[PDB]
Symmetry: C3
Subunit: 109 residues, 3 copies
């Protein structure tokens, strides 16, 4: 799976190594080997979340599989909220997680 | 819905509060409560649009619903072109709007 | 089609004009007119790819068509790996290409 985190927090307020710790958390939360987890963090953006420009973050989670995922995605989301509220010092109401489809992916040889 | 705007305009040429005014415009254009509208602006990127590196912007609009949306999406697109050409001082030919699917989204509690 | 390249390479290590040369390469590789090719490059991000924070890049390729694309997407991916390894001085194992769906897109008038 692929995690993409956009935030309007300034770069200096996003913890160093967030991408490493979020990768490890995702591996544990999603029950996937770390070598199948991808994380991208984009800070310093201009953002409105739920109509408000207060500090916030958007997390996209992309993957090929769709069938039967709704319930597990709710469970996973709750743990990512726990993780991100602590790391980013953001209230859970200022974090939104969305699930997006992929057709395929390939690592280079 | 979720709006994501990438542009190769330098940060200092993207208006302050664009994300707030685009959020309000989206609420009005899409006929959705502002608390369901999300906007992310990513400036200063390196971009080619329709084969050209002149100043440009890409707007992605993501949402769960797909059925019956083609005609309304054309109407909405025209108003977002109006809004963005004024705000960014870009010709409408240098703005591209694309519509992408989501499976679900959740706000934290 | 729409190419979006995220990388944790610093901005000064991403070649100037990468978006122009990647646009031309995509036109040739995909067999599409350059005026239908779009490229966005986002550098300086914090990233983990396949569980590792070593230098890396993610390329997303989005398009409306899905039917019958798996084999051609494998061919195209291999050429984009060739192109990006040279431009970015990254091993092919540090580049991941993913294919995502679009419902529609519109250029402004």
């Amino acid at each position: 799976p692929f995690l993409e985190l956009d935030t309007n927090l300034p770069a200096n307020r996003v913890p160093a190594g967030l991408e490493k710790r979020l990768c490890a958390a995702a591996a544990s939360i999603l029950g996937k080997p770390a070598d199948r987890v991808n994380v991208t963090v984009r800070p310093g953006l201009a953002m409105a979340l739920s109509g408000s420009t207060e500090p916030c973050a958007q997390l996209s989670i992309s993957s090929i599989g769709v069938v039967g995922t709704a319930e597990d995605n709710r469970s996973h989301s709750a743990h990512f909220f726990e993780f991100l509220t602590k790391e980013l010092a953001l209230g859970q109401d200022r974090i939104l997680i969305r699930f997006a489809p992929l057709e395929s992916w390939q690592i280079g040889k």
